[PDB]
């Protein structure tokens, strides 16, 4: 049965497509025809954080919206007090080719990972007034691209070996492994209820996983190139992605099909980061054009720019209360916009 | 294992759905209920937006030393050069100069750093390097067409538009044996070798034809921003570290001409 089983593949692929054909009875771009436009969004810079001496790759806020952490290729991790631009902690690493870092929900640990195939955990508030390592997680065969905390004892990781993994920090072993993609995995986004998460891969497909069971549930398509960024909507029922064909797309969970695409004929570069707002009316994205764009998520029209950098951005973030926006770039500066 | 994908396809096909006419009017009703709490849409008063004590001063005095330590270590790390070592296999890339690996050496009091990542995505990290090293086997006539295309896939990259390339044609001692034995015909793989002539004759005419194929892909489309430097290596050679330094002098001299605008 070399090709006999391959017959049912096309049958199922054309059957689920036909089953999705029925659900498209209208478009999001149709009912949003009568709504107040956002208008010009004019934002200015408030703080500039200097101190890094190389390219900057990742950034993550804290749960109190005051403390934050940043990572750059000089080999350092730095924690910032964003109200007075003070440095609270500065941590030196063992490898310098890092690509991701994370902030812990409680405020006691940070996590870091890069081209060395290991995820590191660092303990912040410990007697003796030092900062040292807690546990090192090994078991991936490719490089690390993302990581996120659930509790003080569980972390999820995404690698370039086409798999995802869930860990237990106390024991130090990979308890659950998620397989099913074809190319490298670049993005990761946890759900607010922390019971599911979506993933983005280097082959233009996005899958939805289940943490307790351990298998896929849904797979989405419609990009023509690799996906670089993905993030969950505040509501928790939808998500957005960003690729190299200069386009951003909004999918759906209970309808299994996409809803909106954000394109412009003057844009020719690829998206590198994306992030939603607190209410879910604005959608901020970063480009290789050395600036960020602010799209209206409900009308797909543009509503502003943030042109304060002189290289590509590569990071983005919004606070939990939605006060300020933080951006890094390859020119070694952090900027706070409001 | 062909049934594994079909099982997942069957598990995916059986799912409940709702129509988009209700799956989008629900996303529309979430913002109108939370519209008056997003500060980035409704500007907050100028006196409430968050963007010294005896302890706040000690905090700043603490923060003022990290800066000097960071700047001291960075200025010290400013010095050295950094190289990237590519090459697929069968070549001996790990035996030319005597996760991720690293290697150090120095000649004439200048330190070099060589990396070997043991590539379409992680190549952005090595965007500010001095030069890339490419190694090829010059005694394996079947993989040459693979090496020729790998070289052109590297030379025409998007992030490597201004990075020069050094090139070593390895294992030249085997090529002399293979060509003087006479049991192998080079035209059996490249028909255009029958017309070529040189501008030990049978080995020289053979190796220059091999070099020309790479130099043609090199000089095809470069626009004079970066160039390629070819060399002939062997299995045992002690004078291989001087060539990289003598070629980085020429990469830096040709780089200073374009900042001070003398060209």
């Amino acid at each position, epitope marked *: 049965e070399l090709d006999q089983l391959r017959q049912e593949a096309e049958q199922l692929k054309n059957q689920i497509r036909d089953a999705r054909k029925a659900c498209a009875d209208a478009t999001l771009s149709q009912i949003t025809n009568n709504i107040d436009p956002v208008g010009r969004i004019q934002m200015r810079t408030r703080r500039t954080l200097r101190g890094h001496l190389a390219k900057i790759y990742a950034m993550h806020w804290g749960t109190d919206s*005051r*403390l934050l952490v940043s990572a750059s290729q000089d080999g350092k991790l730095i924690i910032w*007090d964003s109200y007075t631009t*003070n440095k*609270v902690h500065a941590i030196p690493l063992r490898s310098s080719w890092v690509m991701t870092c994370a902030y812990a929900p409680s405020g006691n640990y940070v996590a870091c990972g890069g081209l060395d195939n290991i995820c590191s955990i660092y303990n912040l508030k410990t*007697r*003796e*007034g*030092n900062v040292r390592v807690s546990r090192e997680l090994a078991g991936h065969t490719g490089y690390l691209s993302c990581c996120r905390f659930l509790d003080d004892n569980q972390i999820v990781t995404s690698s370039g070996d086409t798999t995802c993994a869930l860990w237990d920090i106390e024991t130090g072993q990979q308890t659950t492994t998620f397989t099913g993609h074809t190319g490298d995995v670049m993005s990761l986004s946890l759900a607010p209820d922390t019971r599911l998460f979506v993933s983005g891969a280097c082959d233009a497909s996005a899958k939805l996983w289940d943490v307790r069971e351990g298998m896929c549930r849904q797979t989405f398509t419609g990009h023509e190139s690799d996906i670089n960024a993905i993030c969950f909507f505040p509501n928790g029922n939808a998500f957005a992605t960003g690729s190299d064909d200069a386009t951003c797309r909004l999918f759906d969970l209970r309808a299994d099909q996409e809803l909106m695409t954000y394109s412009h004929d003057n844009i020719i570069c690829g998206i590198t980061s994306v992030s939603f707002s607190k209410s879910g009316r604005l959608l901020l994205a970063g480009y290789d054009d050395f600036n960020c764009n602010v799209w209206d998520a409900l009308k797909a029209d543009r509503a502003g720019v943030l042109a304060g950098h002189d290289n590509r951005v590569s990071c983005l973030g919004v606070t939990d209360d939605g006060m300020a926006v933080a951006t890094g770039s390859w020119d070694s500066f952090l900027k706070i916009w409001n | 294992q062909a049934r594994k994908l079909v099982e997942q396809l069957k598990m995916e096909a059986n799912i409940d759905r709702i129509k988009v006419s209700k799956a989008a009017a629900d996303l529309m009703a979430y913002c109108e209920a939370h519209a008056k709490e997003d500060p980035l849409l409704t500007p907050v008063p100028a006196s409430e937006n968050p963007f010294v*004590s*005896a*302890e*706040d001063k*000690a*905090a700043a*005095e*603490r923060s003022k*030393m990290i800066d000097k330590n960071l700047r001291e270590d960075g200025e010290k790390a400013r010095r050295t050069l950094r190289l990237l070592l590519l090459g697929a296999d069968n070549s001996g890339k790990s035996t030319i100069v005597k996760g991720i690996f690293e290697t150090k050496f120095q000649v004439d009091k200048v330190n070099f750093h060589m990396f070997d990542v043991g590539r379409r995505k992680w190549i952005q990290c090595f965007n500010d390097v001095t030069a890339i090293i490419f190694v090829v086997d010059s005694s394996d006539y079947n993989r040459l067409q693979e090496a020729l295309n790998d070289f052109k896939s590297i030379w025409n990259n998007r992030w490597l538009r201004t990075i020069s390339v050094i090139l070593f044609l390895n294992k030249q001692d085997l090529l002399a044996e293979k060509v003087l034995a006479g049991k192998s015909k080079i035209e059996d793989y490249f028909p255009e070798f029958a017309r070529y002539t040189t501008p030990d004759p049978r080995v020289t005419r053979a190796k220059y034809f091999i070099r020309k194929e790479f130099v043609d892909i090199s000089t095809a489309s470069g626009d004079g921003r970066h160039i390629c430097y070819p060399h002939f290596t062997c299995a045992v050679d002690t004078e291989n570290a001087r060539r990289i330094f003598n070629d980085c002098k020429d990469i830096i001299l040709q780089m200073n001409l374009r900042e001070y605008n003398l060209v």
Partner: single-chain antibody, 230 residues
Framework: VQLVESGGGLVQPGGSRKLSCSAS????????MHWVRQAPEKGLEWVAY????????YYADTVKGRFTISRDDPKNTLFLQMTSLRSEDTAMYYC??????????????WGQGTTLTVSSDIVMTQATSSVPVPGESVSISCRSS???????????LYWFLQRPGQSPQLLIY???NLASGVPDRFSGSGSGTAFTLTISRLEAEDVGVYYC?????????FGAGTKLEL
């Protein structure tokens, strides 16, 4: 963590002395330092302060001029030199560590003191002097001259505890936060100039004198003490 002090003895007036404190168990070169004394039958009193890196020093006006403070990092030692002493310089001397960044807690670990026999500024008021005390909830209070509430939102009032024959301890820092190693029976509250420490579910080993302290501006003024008896 350990901080042991030395020096002491019997001395006649018009003399001099040197005190040393040795530390073992932490990153000494990133903490501030304080010396604090206590008369034979009185409360606590602040003496000197040296910062981290030896870049900011503060003395007490009562002893300014003849005292000196100096630290030696690679040997992990703290030094205090006293000259031209008097009869009011008979007391027990301690050593205290502190650290300052966003979210920290200073004054947390005290040491073992030494004795030496030699034969505007805010004031804190500890109203009560003794209270009989079991499992009975109690309450204590402190009051200041001006309101310690700053424009940052902070409030700089500390609570300590001295059991008989021991060093003091930290319970609450900045009027509302519970330290590490402390049970949840103790709690804190208050407002501007109106504070109250609410100990609930009283148990044993909770007997001793209690003090309040301030940190809003130098100098650092302790209190007179509220004692609890069974």
């Amino acid at each position: 963590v350990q901080l042991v002090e030395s020096g002491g003895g019997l001395v006649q007036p018009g003399g001099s002395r040197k005190l040393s404190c040795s530390a073992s168990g932490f990153a000494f070169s990133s903490f501030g330092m304080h010396w604090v004394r206590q008369a034979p039958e009185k409360g606590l009193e602040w003496v000197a302060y040296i910062s981290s890196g030896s870049g900011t020093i503060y003395y007490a006006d009562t002893v300014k001029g003849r005292f000196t403070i100096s630290r030696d990092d690679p040997k992990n030692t703290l030094f205090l030199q006293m000259t031209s002493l008097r009869s009011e310089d008979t007391a027990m001397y301690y050593c205290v560590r502190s650290i300052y960044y966003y979210g920290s807690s200073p004054f947390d670990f005290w040491g073992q003191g030494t004795t030496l026999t030699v034969s505007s500024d805010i004031v804190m008021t500890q109203a009560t002097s003794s209270v009989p005390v079991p499992g009975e909830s109690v309450s204590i209070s402190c009051r200041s001259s001006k309101s310690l509430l700053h424009s940052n939102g902070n409030t700089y009032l500390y609570w300590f505890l001295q059991r008989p024959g021991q060093s003091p301890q930290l319970l609450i820092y900045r009027m509302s936060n519970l330290a590490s190693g402390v049970p949840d029976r103790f709690s804190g509250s208050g407002s501007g100039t109106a504070f109250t420490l609410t100990i609930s579910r009283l148990e044993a080993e909770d007997v001793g004198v209690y003090y309040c302290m301030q940190h809003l501006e130098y100098p650092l003024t302790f209190g007179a003490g509220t004692k609890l008896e069974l």
